RNA sequence: GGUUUCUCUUCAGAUCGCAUAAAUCUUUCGCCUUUUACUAAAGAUUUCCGUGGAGAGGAACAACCCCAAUUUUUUGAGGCCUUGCUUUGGCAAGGCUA
């Protein structure tokens, strides 16, 4: 009911997981009705999201950017970064 | 704060003094005089609030 | 040949007489007068020589209290009533010449400035 | 005596096909500069004045949402409404691709309206019409809605018959159904077409097809309630027509409620129209109120931008019917086709039709459109005169660019690069050039042609001889007559054989 | 709401339907409904075996309809 | 403190009707075309005089060729109205001049006779429209009988309200009222700062009242123009308050008394 | 409508791309778009499930058939959120 | 958590205060025997009658029921065989189904 739980992680970074399983790293600048995600400077990660591994953190990486996805497949939402004040 | 008074107060002082001839007051003499420098303020003030003939 | 101006003067009802008189003063040739539909206004249209086109705006607005208002465009040239070449027509040099001599003077003064 | 957004406008620049080049024209006093003013506020929340008459025209460049949200680049050449400054209408119709005639609800057809449709026909532009100042039918005129519609239909039929007078091909008949004419009352914050009127009708109410609905309203169609079905003549209900029923009647009450029942009926009707208003903003006086309420109901500007984009060439479509008149050849081998691309590319053949001098100095700011090429700072460019013919090259003075400006009405916007499709104010090529110039590549020679120097509507007939009081300062007086000749389109000066300085004017 | 395909300009032209199943047909797309359904005549299905076999008029199910790609410049 | 009033439109229309006598029956400014402050400023500067306007002392104080009487054509003789309408065309050395002009779109707001007939009501005053043409037109007319139909939720956007009321013709009349009335809310002024007769002496053609009163007209015009011309922004501020500085002292008391009483008081004190 | 859908609508005309539900990508300029997601694109490139890339002239594809879609560096500029 | 109001402190009108008074100085103008008191233009500066901005206290008064087959809370996307691949992992391909 308090309805901020969306916007509070909005304006913050987010790792979005679609029903395709990969990691889409982008700023949650907003949501939509169907739960679509329009997030900029985004990165497409396929091998993993890296978590302080002495081996490495950069495998299967591409730059997507300003991506606008339809929320039909928007599955999981996590916080991967804080706001960059840009 | 500074607060108002009954009108009869001033009215009494003024009809008391009248025209300053009685040796009773004898110092408001000089203060009265010194008040002349502002008599053109009193007159402008009085005349700009005059009663606007529909009121009695 | 001197040019003519087409003028389109919106006017309230009364000053029709006024615009008529003023145009007569300046050799008018009012052609048209017809209302504006959806308003109690008239629009009058007329020619007037480029010569007498001068200050006619101010004259009209003054006489009618600005109620009327004149806008003007060149429309066409035309023959001036004058005989450009007659020596027996002389110039009273400041009084206004009557129509038989407008082109006579016009030439004399124009060359006097320019043509010698 | 725009950091994150000028990049955006520049990408729209390089788009060259979200951009619209029009001259905003009409008769005197008819609302033009007021609409533009309210519009500059819509954009930034951020002699002429005392004369109350607009004298010279001004260019504006803005980024506007249409009724779906796509931002557009708008080049608007707002003209004078005075008969004698029609040379400004000439320069505007040159450097822009269409015309918007704005006409008063109170007058309709007069001199500048008529001869402006004439000029736009003889130069083959797009034909837009915005009927403006619609309160002058309601509060000023007190016209019941049916006869209101009568007058509107009349203005439309008169202007249309007159365009039929000047146009061989009846490719276009104008009426608000097609995207020809906006309805506006510029100061009272109103712009609409049947389109956007019915679209907000829908956006507030049920789902109904806004576009098909807009197809139903103007022009003698009725609607019967029980059917809910639009009909050619068959109510003996003896009622109004769809346009009246749906636009006039409601807004007639809207106004009559604003000005008559400002106190009581406005709260309830304000609810019913969905807009709330706070106490202090209903504590306003009647005209500021009506302006704010009309904004909060009718939305920003949409009739205008919608109709305009809907009937705009956009120089990329643009160039082709123009190079016929613009260019001295039209299309032969090199440069007709070069510009015809309308691409940001190569040739750089330009048409500068304005020169606005700095209040500070003697210099100008040249102003014209990029038909070909891409002009940037420090770029050497060689100008093509009015007397420059292919085998008369002395006339071509060769120069560079000092700085680059773009115009919102009276704020100056400097950047380093601009491509084809736009207008631009050039610094540096004033001193060589005269009323009109046509710009080409600097030290790059393939070969160039020129446009015919601008032709006018008006006959210049008035004769004025001028002298300094002491003949000593005659060369300075000559400097002044230069500067006026360059800053004015058809003011023509001559040093007459009598030794004098005559000016010929309107 | 209930906005249909902007298929007026797209009506009356041969497009290839790529839908589910890897489902490939060709056919002249001349009409549809606002559910994004098609009614495409002269449809020649391009099976995996490569064969294009013509079956004629059908109702082009937008339900799993992925995309139509035309052969003209309309 | 008695400021910043807000009023009801009934109130305003009644008042208007009551102050109808001391008021101007003008609707716009195309009356005062060559009769406004700026025209007067130009005149004053050129030492010319409008027929019915004021006169001022001249501002400052051999041969020419354009004045050669052999080269001129006088078809219509120049007059001071022209020399003031176009200051720069019709005058050499035009200095300290304001160029005033006005093509104000004439306003046509039609007075009603009774309150009775509706707010919107075509009156004979308007000229009957009767727009004529050829075979008028035809349109890209989307005939029905293909189909169209209105889901009966919408309505003509408001039909539940009548177009007019017992407040409408007022609310229209109050749209062209002199500045005091054409408002509804604003501050209150001092009692002196209200000139009732300005609209009276500012009129253009008094049309045949004695030379006495016409000269009076013009000299009031002159005073007005000079006041307008010599106006300074207040330019500076320090902010003594004589009477507060007085009241904050131990010798001054205060009261509310009757005017006439303080009047006889003041006279006695002065004597 | 939705804020991403509005970003897409205003993206009519700008340079964009899409990745449809099946894992192939098509890039193009903005030709057409709807609030119902029916995507009209032109002069596009196509890159398939192995990577086959080419040109496609014009197309219009259902909304649900799109999963991801690439916008250019312009629109990020309703920053009220 | 807001107005009204009292008082206390502090800064400004660049078109005002939809009104408009006086003074000083420099110079022309006029009245004319001298000075004051005046005329009526210009320029430069001021006082006064009001207003605006800020802040501080202080006071009074308001108040702790239906629902999903193209975009997500129903959706049949199901399996495997074989092959090629690559270090295994795993990838991609055809087929059989029921
Ligand atoms: N009454 C009323 N007047 C309006 C409205 N909208 C615009 N105007 C008029 O617009 C005028 C503003 O100046 P403009 O008439 O646009 O100046 P202009 O016509 O562009 O002059 P030019 O540039 O020479 O053409 C105001 O004086 C109004 O008379 C409106 O909604 N109601
Ligand atoms: Mg203007
Ligand atoms: Mg002595």
- Give the H/E segment covering residue F6: strand F5-6
CB within 8 A of D410, min separation 6: which ones? Answer: D58
In the reported structure, the alpha carbon of residue D466 is separated from the centroid of ligand 1 by a whole-number distance in angstroms of: 35
Q: What does CATH list as the number for E8-70?
A: 2.30.30.100
**Chain pair C-F, CB pairs under 8 angstroms:** 81
| Beta carbons of E14 and E29 less than 8 angstroms apart | yes
CB neighbourhood size of D103 (10 A): 25
The CA distance from D312 to D304, in Å, is 12
Proximity of residue A73 CB to strand H below 7 A: yes
Q: What is the DSSP track for F7-76?
A: --HHHHHHHHHHTTTTS----SSSSSSSSSHHHHHHHHHHT---TTS-----S-----STT-TTS---SS
Question: Token digits for D239?
Answer: 């009622």
Proximity of residue G23 CB to strand H below 7 A: no
Proximity of residue F99 CB to strand H below 7 A: no
Pick the residue of E36, E62, E64, E71 with the most G CBs within 10 A to test the interface with G by mutation.
E36
Phi, psi of C56 (to 5 degrees): -50, -35
CB neighbourhood size of D301 (10 A): 25
Query: Which ligand has its closest atom nearest to the C-alpha of D31?
Result: 1
Counting CB pairs under 8 A, whether chains F and C reach 3 or more, is: yes
Helix (H) and strand (E) counts for chain A?
Answer: 1, 5
Residue D440 assigned ligand-binding role: no
The CA distance from D261 to F165, in Å, is 8
**Cα–Cα–Cα angle for D323, D327, D329, rounded to 5 degrees:** 100
Three-state SS annotation for D427-454:
CCCCCCCCCCEEEECCCCCCCCCCECCC
CB neighbourhood size of D461 (10 A): 16
CB within 8 A of E19, min separation 6: which ones? Answer: E25, E61, E64, E65, E66, E67
- Give the H/E segment covering residue C30: strand C30-36
**D253 closest CA partner among C88, D244, D320:** D244
The CA distance from D460 to D56, in Å, is 17
CB within 8 A of G5, min separation 6: which ones? Answer: A32, A36, G35, G37
Provide the edge-to-edge strand list for the sheet that holds D366-370.
D398-399, D381-384, D437-440, D350-355, D366-370, D423-426, D404-408, D411-415
The CA distance from A34 to A68, in Å, is 12
Number of structural domains chain A divides into: 1
The CA distance from D321 to D326, in Å, is 9
**Through-space separation of residue D69 CA and nucleotide H20 C1' in angstroms:** 54
CA atoms within 13 A on the CB side of D294: 29
**F179 closest CA partner among F201, F198, F205, F156:** F198
D382-421: string of b/e by CB count within 10 Å (b at 16+)? bbbbbebeeeeeebbeebebeebebbbbeeeeebeebbbb
Tell me the best of D23, D26, D28, D32 to mutate to test the pocket of ligand 1, counting ligand atoms within 8 Å of each CB and taking the most: D32
| Beta carbons of D17 and D100 less than 8 angstroms apart | no
| Beta carbons of D429 and D468 less than 8 angstroms apart | no
Out of G12, G72, G77, the one facing D70 most closely (by C-beta) is G12
3 state SS of F5: strand
- Give the H/E segment covering residue G8: helix G3-10
Question: Token digits for C17?
Answer: 């007489």
Question: Token digits for C54?
Answer: 């001068």
**Through-space separation of residue G23 CA and nucleotide H92 C1' in angstroms:** 14
CB within 8 A of D233, min separation 6: which ones? Answer: D220, D222
The CA distance from E74 to F3, in Å, is 70
Mark out chain F residues that contact chain C at CB-CB < 8 A.
30-31, 33-34, 69-76, 78-79, 81-82, 85, 102-104, 106, 108, 110, 125-131, 204-205
Q: What is the DSSP letter of D327?
A: B
In the reported structure, the alpha carbon of residue B33 is separated from the centroid of ligand 3 by a whole-number distance in angstroms of: 35
**C46 closest CA partner among C24, C66, C67, C61:** C24
**Burial of G38: CB neighbours in 10 Å, binned 0-12, 13-18, 19+:** buried
CA–C1' nearest nucleotide, residue G36 = H71
- Distance of alpha carbon C30 from the chain centroid: 10
The CA distance from G27 to G46, in Å, is 7
| Beta carbons of D88 and D109 less than 8 angstroms apart | no
From residue E5, how far is each of E34, F150, G81 by CA, in Å?
6, 21, 30
**Cα–Cα–Cα angle for F16, F20, F23, rounded to 5 degrees:** 105
3 state SS of D161: helix
Question: Token digits for B54?
Answer: 């529909």
**Which chain E residue's Cα is nearest to G41?**
E69
Q: What is the DSSP letter of F154?
A: -
| Beta carbons of F37 and F69 less than 8 angstroms apart | no
CB within 8 A of D188, min separation 6: which ones? Answer: D135, D290, D291, D294
- List the subunits that have 3+ CB pairs under 8 angstroms with B: F
The CA distance from F262 to B42, in Å, is 10
In the reported structure, the alpha carbon of residue D410 is separated from the centroid of ligand 2 by a whole-number distance in angstroms of: 14
Whether residues D140 and F109 touch (CB distance < 8 A) is answered with yes
Distance from CA of E41 to the nearest CA of G (A): 18
Q: Nearest 10 degrees: CA dihedral of D158, D161, D162, D164?
A: 160
Question: Token digits for F125?
Answer: 């005053």
Q: What is the DSSP letter of G21?
A: T
Angle of helix C16-25 versus helix C56-63 axis, rounded to 10: 150
Q: What is the DSSP track for D127-140?
A: EEEEEE-THHHHTT
- Distance of alpha carbon F261 from the chain centroid: 42
Q: Nearest 10 degrees: CA dihedral of A16, A19, A23, A25?
A: -30
- List the subunits that have 3+ CB pairs under 8 angstroms with D: C, F, G
3 state SS of D190: coil
Residue entry with tokens 């029956």:
F25
From residue B8, how far is each of B5, B13, B56, F258 by CA, in Å?
8, 9, 21, 12
The CA distance from D346 to D337, in Å, is 12
Question: Which residue is nearest nucleotide H14, judged by alpha carbon to C1' distance?
Answer: F233
CB within 8 A of D64, min separation 6: which ones? Answer: D43, D71, D72, D74, D301, D305
The CA distance from F133 to F144, in Å, is 27
Question: Using a CB-CB distance cutoff of 8 angstroms, which residues of chain C are in contact with residue D147?
Answer: 38
Does G56 contact A at CB distance below 8 Å? no
Question: Using a CB-CB distance cutoff of 8 angstroms, which residues of chain F are in contact with residue B40?
Answer: none
The CA distance from D5 to F232, in Å, is 43
Three-state SS annotation for chain E:
CCCCCCCCCCCCEEEEEEEHHHEEEEEEEEEECCCCCEEEEEEEEECCCCCEEEEECCCECCCCEEEEEECCCC
Bridge partners for D327 per DSSP: D451
Does G13 contact A at CB distance below 8 Å? no
Residue entry with tokens 């061989």:
D168
Helix (H) and strand (E) counts for chain D?
Answer: 18, 22
Counting CB pairs under 8 A, whether chains A and G reach 3 or more, is: yes
Question: Token digits for D227?
Answer: 């059917």
The CA distance from D96 to D421, in Å, is 10
3 state SS of G62: coil
**G3 closest CA partner among E19, F168, A7:** A7
The CA distance from D486 to D357, in Å, is 9
Distance from CA of D268 to the nearest CA of C (A): 33
Residue D32 assigned ligand-binding role: yes
Pick the residue of F164, F171, F174, F185 with the most D CBs within 10 A to test the interface with D by mutation.
F171
The CA distance from G45 to F136, in Å, is 52
| Beta carbons of F109 and D140 less than 8 angstroms apart | yes
- Distance of alpha carbon A43 from the chain centroid: 8
Query: Which ligand has its closest atom nearest to the C-alpha of D39?
Result: 1
The CA distance from D359 to G6, in Å, is 44
Range list of H helices, chain C: 16-25, 56-63, 102-113
Residue extents of the structural domains in chain G? 1-81
The CA distance from D67 to F22, in Å, is 52
- List the subunits that have 3+ CB pairs under 8 angstroms with C: D, F
CB within 8 A of D29, min separation 6: which ones? Answer: D53, D81, F103, F104, F105
In the reported structure, the alpha carbon of residue C73 is separated from the centroid of ligand 2 by a whole-number distance in angstroms of: 20
Question: Token digits for F119?
Answer: 């707010």
CA–C1' nearest nucleotide, residue G37 = H71
- Give the H/E segment covering residue D48: helix D48-51
In the reported structure, the alpha carbon of residue D30 is separated from the centroid of ligand 1 by a whole-number distance in angstroms of: 5
From residue G50, how far is each of A18, G46, G53, G67 by CA, in Å?
21, 11, 9, 18
Whether D34 is in the pocket of ligand 1, judged by its Cβ within 6 Å, is: yes
The CA distance from D93 to D436, in Å, is 14
Residue entry with tokens 């070909």:
D372
Question: Token digits for D320?
Answer: 């082709």
| Beta carbons of D111 and D27 less than 8 angstroms apart | yes
3 state SS of D376: strand
The CA distance from C97 to C86, in Å, is 14
- Which bases of strand H have any atom within 7 Å of the beta carbon of a protein residue? 4-8, 10-21, 28, 40-42, 46-52, 69-72, 76-77, 92-95
Proximity of residue E66 CB to strand H below 7 A: no
**D421 closest CA partner among D321, D342, D340, D320:** D342
In the reported structure, the alpha carbon of residue D55 is separated from the centroid of ligand 3 by a whole-number distance in angstroms of: 66
Fold observed for domain G1-81: SH3 type barrels. (2.30.30)
**Which chain C residue's Cα is nearest to F77?**
C96
CB neighbourhood size of F220 (10 A): 16
**Through-space separation of residue F244 CA and nucleotide H12 C1' in angstroms:** 22
Proximity of residue E58 CB to strand H below 7 A: no
Bridge partners for D150 per DSSP: none
Resolution (A): 3.0
- Give the H/E segment covering residue F261: helix F259-270
Tell me the best of D26, D27, D30, D34 to mutate to test the pocket of ligand 1, counting ligand atoms within 8 Å of each CB and taking the most: D34
From residue A37, how far is each of A14, A29, A74, G6 by CA, in Å?
10, 8, 8, 12
Query: Which ligand has its closest atom nearest to the C-alpha of D26?
Result: 1
Out of D8, D17, D68, the one facing G77 most closely (by C-beta) is D8
Range list of H helices, F111-239: 168-173, 198-201, 211-229
The CA distance from D152 to D247, in Å, is 13
CB within 8 A of B33, min separation 6: which ones? Answer: none
Question: Using a CB-CB distance cutoff of 8 angstroms, which residues of chain G are in contact with residue A31?
Answer: 3
Enclosing domain of residue A9: 1-84
Question: Token digits for F97?
Answer: 């001049």
The CA distance from D99 to D111, in Å, is 17
The CA distance from D473 to B10, in Å, is 79
Angle of helix D302-310 versus helix D194-204 axis, rounded to 10: 120
Pairing of strands D404-408, G39-47: unpaired
- Give the H/E segment covering residue D150: helix D145-166
CB neighbourhood size of D114 (10 A): 18
| Beta carbons of G1 and A30 less than 8 angstroms apart | no
Mark out chain E residues that contact chain G at CB-CB < 8 A.
3, 5-7, 10, 36, 62, 65-70, 73-74
CB within 8 A of F213, min separation 6: which ones? Answer: F206
Out of B5, B14, B39, the one facing F270 most closely (by C-beta) is B39
The CA distance from D111 to D105, in Å, is 16
Phi, psi of D449 (to 5 degrees): -130, 170
Provide the edge-to-edge strand list for the sheet that holds C69-78.
C30-36, C41-49, C2-11, C69-78
**C21 closest CA partner among C12, C13, C30:** C30
Q: Nearest 10 degrees: CA dihedral of D191, D197, D202, D204?
A: 50
- Give the H/E segment covering residue D383: strand D381-384
Terminal Cα distance for chain B, rounded = 32
């Amino acid at each position: 009911g308090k309805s901020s739980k969306m916007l509070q992680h909005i304006d913050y970074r987010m790792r979005c997981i679609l029903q395709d399983g990969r990691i889409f790293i982008g700023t949650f600048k907003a949501f939509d009705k169907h739960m679509n995600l329009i997030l900029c400077d985004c990165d497409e990660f396929r091998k993993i999201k890296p978590k302080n591994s002495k081996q490495a953190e950069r495998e299967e990486k591409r730059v997507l950017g300003l991506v606008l996805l339809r929320g039909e497949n928007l599955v999981s939402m996590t916080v991967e970064g804080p706001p960059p004040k840009d | 704060q500074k607060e108002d008074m009954p009108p009869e107060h001033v009215r009494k002082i003024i009809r008391d003094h009248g025209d300053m001839t009685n040796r009773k007051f004898r110092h408001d003499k000089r203060v009265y005089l010194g008040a002349l420098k502002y008599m053109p303020h009193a007159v402008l003030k009085l005349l700009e609030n005059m009663p606007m003939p529909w009121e009695q | 040949m001197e040019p003519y101006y087409f003028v389109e003067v919106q006017a309230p009802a009364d000053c029709v007489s006024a615009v008529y008189t003023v145009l007569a003063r300046r050799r008018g040739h009012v052609t048209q007068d017809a209302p504006i539909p959806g308003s109690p206004l008239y629009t009058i249209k007329a020619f007037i020589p480029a010569i007498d086109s001068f200050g006619f705006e101010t004259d009209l607005r003054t006489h009618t209290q600005g109620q009327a208002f004149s806008l003007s465009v060149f429309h066409h040239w035309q023959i001036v009533p004058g005989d450009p070449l007659d020596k027996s027509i002389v110039i009273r040099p400041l009084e206004p010449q009557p129509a038989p001599h407008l082109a006579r003077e016009f030439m004399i003064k124009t060359r006097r400035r320019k043509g010698l | 005596t725009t950091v994150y957004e000028m990049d955006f406008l520049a990408d729209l620049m390089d788009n060259s096909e979200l951009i619209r080049n029009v001259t905003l024209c009409g008769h005197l006093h008819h609302g033009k500069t007021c609409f533009v003013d309210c519009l500059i506020e819509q954009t930034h929340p951020e002699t002429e004045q005392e004369r109350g008459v607009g004298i010279k025209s001004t260019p504006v460049t803005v980024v506007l949402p249409d009724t779906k949200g796509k931002s557009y680049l708008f080049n608007i050449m707002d003209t004078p409404g005075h008969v004698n400054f029609s040379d400004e209408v000439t320069a505007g119709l040159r450097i822009s691709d269409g015309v918007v005639l704005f006409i008063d609800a109170a007058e309709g057809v007069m001199l500048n309206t008529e001869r402006l449709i004439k000029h736009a026909v003889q130069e083959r532009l797009a034909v837009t019409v915005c009927i403006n100042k619609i309160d002058r039918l309601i509060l000023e005129l007190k016209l019941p809605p049916t006869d209101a519609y009568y007058k509107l239909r009349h203005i439309v039929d008169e202007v249309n018959g007159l365009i039929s007078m000047y146009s061989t091909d009846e490719n276009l008949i104008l009426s608000p159904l097609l995207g020809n004419v906006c309805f506006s009352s510029s100061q009272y914050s109103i712009c609409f077409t049947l389109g956007s009127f019915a679209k907000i009708y829908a956006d507030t109410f049920g789902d109904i097809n806004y576009q098909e609905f807009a197809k139903r309203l103007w022009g003698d169609i009725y609607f019967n309630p029980k059917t809910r079905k639009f009909t050619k003549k068959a109510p003996t209900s003896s009622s109004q027509r769809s346009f009246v029923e749906f636009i006039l009647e409601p807004l007639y009450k809207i106004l009559a409620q604003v000005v008559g029942d400002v106190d009581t009926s406005l709260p309830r009707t304000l609810d019913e129209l969905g807009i709330h208003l706070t106490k202090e903003e209903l504590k306003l006086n009647i005209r500021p109120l009506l302006r704010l309420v009309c904004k909060k109901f009718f939305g920003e500007f949409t009739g205008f931008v919608d109709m305009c984009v809907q009937h705009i060439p956009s120089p990329k479509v643009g160039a082709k019917p123009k190079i016929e008149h613009t260019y001295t050849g039209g299309v032969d081998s090199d440069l007709g086709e070069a510009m015809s691309d309308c691409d940001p590319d190569g040739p750089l053949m330009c048409h500068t039709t304005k020169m606005y001098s700095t209040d500070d100095g003697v210099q100008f700011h040249a102003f014209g459109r990029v038909l070909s090429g891409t002009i940037h700072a420090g770029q050497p460019v060689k100008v093509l005169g009015e007397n420059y013919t292919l085998e008369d090259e002395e006339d071509s003075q060769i120069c560079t660019v000092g700085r680059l400006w773009i115009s919102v009405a009276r704020y100056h916007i400097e950047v380093n690069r601009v491509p084809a499709g736009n207008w631009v104010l050039i610094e540096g090529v004033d001193q060589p050039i005269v009323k009109t110039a046509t710009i080409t590549e600097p030290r790059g020679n393939e070969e160039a042609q020129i446009f015919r120097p601008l032709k006018f509507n008006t006959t210049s007939v008035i004769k004025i001889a001028v002298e300094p009081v002491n003949p000593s300062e005659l060369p300075k007086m000559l400097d002044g007559l230069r500067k006026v000749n360059k800053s004015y389109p058809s003011l023509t000066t001559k040093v007459e054989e009598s030794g004098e300085h005559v000016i010929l004017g309107t | 709401k209930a906005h249909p395909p902007e298929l007026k300009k797209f009506m009356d032209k041969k497009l290839s339907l790529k839908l589910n199943g890897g489902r490939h047909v060709q056919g002249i797309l001349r009409g549809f409904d606002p559910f994004m359904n098609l009614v495409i005549d002269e449809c020649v299905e391009m099976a995996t075996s490569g064969q294009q076999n013509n079956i004629g008029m059908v109702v082009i199910r937008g339900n799993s309809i992925i995309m139509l790609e035309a052969l003209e410049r309309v | 403190t008695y400021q910043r009033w807000q009023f009801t439109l009934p109130m305003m229309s009644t008042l208007y009707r009551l102050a109808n006598q001391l008021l101007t029956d003008l609707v716009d400014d195309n009356y005062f075309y060559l009769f406004d402050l700026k025209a007067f400023f130009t005149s004053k500067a050129l030492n010319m005089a409008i027929p019915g306007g004021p006169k001022f002392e001249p501002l400052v104080r051999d041969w020419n060729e354009f004045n050669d009487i052999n080269k001129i054509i006088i078809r219509q003789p120049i007059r001071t109205e022209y020399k003031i309408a176009f200051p720069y065309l019709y005058n050499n050395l035009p200095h300290h001049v304001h160029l005033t002009w006005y093509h104000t779109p004439n306003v046509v707001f039609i007075k009603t006779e009774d309150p009775d007939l509706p707010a919107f009501y075509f009156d004979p005053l308007i000229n009957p429209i009767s727009h004529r043409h050829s075979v008028k037109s035809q349109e890209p007319l989307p005939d029905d009988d293909e189909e169209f139909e209105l889901p009966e939720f919408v309505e003509p956007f408001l039909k539940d309200t009548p177009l007019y009321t017992d407040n409408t013709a007022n609310g229209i009349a109050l749209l062209w009222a002199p500045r005091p009335f054409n408002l509804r809310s604003g501050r209150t002024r001092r009692a002196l700062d209200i000139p009732l007769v300005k609209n009276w002496y500012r009129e253009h053609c008094p049309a045949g009242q004695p030379v006495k009163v016409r000269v009076s007209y013009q000299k009031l015009l002159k005073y007005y123009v000079l006041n307008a011309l010599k106006h300074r922004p207040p330019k500076a501020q320090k902010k003594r308050y004589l009477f507060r500085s007085f009241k904050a002292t131990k010798f001054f008391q205060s009261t509310k008394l009757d005017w006439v009483e303080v009047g006889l008081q003041v006279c006695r004190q002065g004597y | 409508i939705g804020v991403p859908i509005k970003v897409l609508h205003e993206a009519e005309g700008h340079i964009v791309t899409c990745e449809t539900n099946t894992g192939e990508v098509y890039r193009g300029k903005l030709i057409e778009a709807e609030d119902n997601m029916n995507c009209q694109m032109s002069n596009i490139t196509v890159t398939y499930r192995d990577g086959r890339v080419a040109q496609l002239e014009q197309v219009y594809i259902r909304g649900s058939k799109i999963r991801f879609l690439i916008l250019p560096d312009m629109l990020k500029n309703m920053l009220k959120s």
